[PDB]
């Protein structure tokens, strides 16, 4: 049920993600960005009133994050909308230029 179009950025740096997330001061706000290392993404998110980043590693057709693994990035995000990602924080508010304009 997570929708990549609402949170995914193919081309966005860490600094740009931070500038976006500063504008929506809600824990659980997040976006996902491709990194310029192969088979790598970052989830940039707010938790504990701060902006943090975690890496997601692709291996073959699956993506890995800590003790967890999924058939797609969309499925990983779906899972962490239902289960906590960082301490008690779940992914809650997908952030994009569209969201921010509103």
């Amino acid at each position: 049920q997570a929708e990549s179009k609402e949170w995914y950025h193919a081309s966005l740096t860490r600094a740009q993600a931070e500038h976006m997330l500063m504008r929506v001061p809600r824990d659980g706000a997040f976006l996902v960005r491709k990194r310029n290392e192969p088979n790598s993404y970052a989830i940039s998110f707010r938790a504990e009133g701060k902006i943090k980043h975690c890496r997601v590693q692709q291996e073959g057709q699956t993506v890995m994050l800590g003790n967890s693994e999924f058939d797609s990035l969309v499925d990983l995000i779906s899972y962490y909308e239902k289960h906590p990602l960082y301490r008690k924080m779940k992914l809650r508010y997908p952030i994009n230029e569209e969201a921010l304009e509103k």
Partner: peptide, 8 residues
Amino acid sequence: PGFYVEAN
């Protein structure tokens, strides 16, 4: 952690 944190 460093520049990136570990997920649960």
